[PDB]
Amino acid sequence: RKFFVGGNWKMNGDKKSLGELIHTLNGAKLSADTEVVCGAPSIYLDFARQKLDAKIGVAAQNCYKVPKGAFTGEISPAMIKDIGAAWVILGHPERRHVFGESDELIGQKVAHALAEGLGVIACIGEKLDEREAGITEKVVFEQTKAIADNVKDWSKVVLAYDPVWAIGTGKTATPQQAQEVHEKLRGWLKTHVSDAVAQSTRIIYGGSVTGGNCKELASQHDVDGFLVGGASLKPEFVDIINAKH
Amino acid sequence: RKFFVGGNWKMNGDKKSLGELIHTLNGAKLSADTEVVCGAPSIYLDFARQKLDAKIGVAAQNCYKVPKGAFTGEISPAMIKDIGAAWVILGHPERRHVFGESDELIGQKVAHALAEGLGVIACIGEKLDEREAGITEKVVFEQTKAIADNVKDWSKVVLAYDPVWAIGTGKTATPQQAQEVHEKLRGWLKTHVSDAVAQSTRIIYGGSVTGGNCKELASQHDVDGFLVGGASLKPEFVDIINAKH
Asked: In which residues is substrate bound (chains A, B)?
């Protein structure tokens, strides 16, 4: 499993600051062993793909489930591909809780993006009241199944364990809590899909990952990378990419 | 009131086909008396703005209510202005009924796009069941009010009456049914805002406008232009722009 690091710019940037950020990234010393993808605002996807080194992938932050049609405000996987992007982030928790995206919609988007040849970084994670109610497992397994039931080819899927309570709060999950969930997801994969899928699929961690935080998270056996929010907008992002060095 | 025509491309095109379409608009003979705006998919806004003649405006099909933050999949007015677009379409029936945007949310979005310097094409419209119930008026005054409560400067606002039953169905409102709502909205503005706002605000009609239909609807006294979907992707778009000629 190749170490995977995804930066999610979320709703941040202009061409001037995304330009600086990109310049830095292109000049940096990035492990040859980490696979890097940056998730840019839709408005900036083409600029990002044009400016970023080809060795770095570009992902869309969201998409809809059909190729064209009367959906004012949406973009499809066909348009994403047209600009040169290779990934889409689906199921992010902000899409789930701020915008009401249901597991059923998310599963339809995954199957569509996959049909169109995009790679998918699919997000799952419980809320704190769920953690504390002792149902983490139930919740993540329910969200994972909705995704899995819509995946025919795992070669282009990256699972992202994103506990809602850790996203932008500073409350990173300890390495032990990340490791506990990733191990159980990998276990789920093995029993519901296959050993072969369990072993090759990357399961990345997201939620308040920092240059300071990463080494320790990264040494966990079932952690294959990170999905970085706030820190992907900073030079330490380069430190996260090289977390295994 | 300067006649206004907005083309909403919705979720369609690639660089090649939008490029062709754009070339068509740049070389066509377009009425100097019509204000034209093309609403491009977010992923193509910068491309559109760069290839389109400066006389034709560019509009985003949607935006969020803050300049930046943790809103994966969203874009803000600051970004829209960064690439040179001057408008945004808000409250479109597809955003309202497919993506559940509420009146409160649409309102907050208007107030922000406006504080930020963009013009807003704001949509209102009843569903078939409301028309049949005879409540078209109650419904548009209510949606209208939700927009108005957030407008300080009406000079950068275009009201689009887009009955849902007319969107993409082929079922165009009749010249007399469009005229009757427009006159009602204009009087709404007159009693609730001011006579000057009423007099100066453009009220455009959306819903199955074709090269075929346009002349008779444009002849109605309170109909200031059109919001065009499906036909904005065709040559006939030029005829619509030129409806009063």
From this structure: 8, 10
**Residues ≥6 apart with Cβ < 8 Å to A62:** A42, A75, A88, A89, A90, A92, A95, B72, B73
Contact at CB, B79 and A41, closer than 8 angstroms? yes
Q: Residue A190 — φ and ψ, nearest 5°?
A: -65, -40
Start-to-end Cα distance in chain B = 16
Q: Under 8 Å CB-to-CB from A235, ≥6 apart: which residues?
A: A24
Tokens of A93: 């928790």
H or E segment and range at residue B161: strand B157-161
> Six-digit token pair at B229?
């979907």
A117: left (phi over 0), alpha (psi -120 to 50) or beta: left
Q: Which of A117, A146, A144, A115 is nearest to A203 (CA)?
A: A144
> Which residues 6+ apart lie within 8 Å of B105 measured at CB?
B65
| Token digits of residue A177 | 């809590």
d(C-alpha B46, C-alpha A89), whole Å: 22
**DSSP secondary structure string, A84-138?**
T--EEEES-HHHHHTS---HHHHHHHHHHHHHTT-EEEEEE---HHHHHTT-HHH
Q: End-to-end CA distance of chain A: give it in Å, rounded.
A: 16
Chain A interface, Cβ < 8 Å to B: 8, 10-15, 39, 41-47, 60-62, 64, 66, 68-76, 78-80, 82-83, 89, 92, 94-95, 98-100, 167-168, 229-230
Side-chain half-sphere CA neighbours of B88 within 13 A? 27
Domain ranges of chain A: 1-245
Backbone angles phi, psi at A165, to 5 degrees: -70, -15
**The pair of three-digit structure tokens given for residue B135, joined into one six-digit string:** 């409540």
For chain A, give me the number of helices (H) and strands (E)? 11, 8
Q: How far is A40 from chain B (nearest CA, A)?
A: 9
Minimal CA separation from A76 to chain B, in Å: 7
Looking at residue A4, its amino acid is F
SS3 at position A216: helix
Measured at the CA of A66, the angle between CA A62 and CA A69, to 5 degrees, comes to 105
β-pair partners for A174:
none
Distance between CA A206 and CA A228 in Å, rounded? 6
Q: How far apart are CA B169 and CA B127, in angstroms?
A: 13
- Superfamily of the domain at B1-245: Aldolase class I (3.20.20.70)
Contact A87, A60 (CB under 8 A): yes
B60 SS3 class: strand
d(CA A137, CA B109): 37
